[PDB]
Amino acid sequence: FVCNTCPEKWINFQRKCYYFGKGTKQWVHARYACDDMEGQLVSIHSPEEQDFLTKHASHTGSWIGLRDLDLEGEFIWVDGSHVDYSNWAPGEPNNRSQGEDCVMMRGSGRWNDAFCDRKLGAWVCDRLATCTPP
């Protein structure tokens, strides 16, 4: 009936749980780290979800679950969903023809693209919250 239960060290917002990771990681690094924890690198689909992430975001930048796929020819989230909501910094993205294929979130919450082998100090995972029983 009510789904706001999250594992130790994760934070609940709406029906989801979020892990604000800290550590030195390239994008595909953070992708597998989230998978190891039974989550996914975060997908963002509304301004309310973004505003929650901004309140907890590392000041020095974080990987999120968006990257440019060559065959589909667009940015696609790790869970296969398309970009509806977006929060690009003004002028972004600007490195698609330039090999900057992975997306990070600044301390402001705004997104920019980057080289996938860039090292950042933070990354965010999500998973679904579990629910109250009968």
Numbering used by the authors: 158 to 291
Question: What text appears in the publication on this structure?
Answer:
To determine whether the absence of this calcium‐binding site affects the structure and function of human CD23, CD23 mutant proteins with increasingly “murine‐like” sequences were generated. Restoration of the calcium‐binding site was confirmed by NMR spectroscopy, and structures of mutant human CD23 proteins were determined by X‐ray crystallography, although no electron density for calcium was observed. This study offers insights into the evolutionary differences between murine and human CD23 and some of the functional differences between CD23 in different species.
Immunoglobulin E (IgE) is a central regulatory and triggering molecule of allergic immune responses. IgE’s interaction with CD23 modulates both IgE production and functional activities.CD23 is a noncanonical immunoglobulin receptor, unrelated to receptors of other antibody isotypes. Human CD23 is a calcium‐dependent (C‐type) lectin‐like domain that has apparently lost its carbohydrate‐binding capability. The calcium‐binding site classically required for carbohydrate binding in C‐type lectins is absent in human CD23 but is present in the murine molecule.
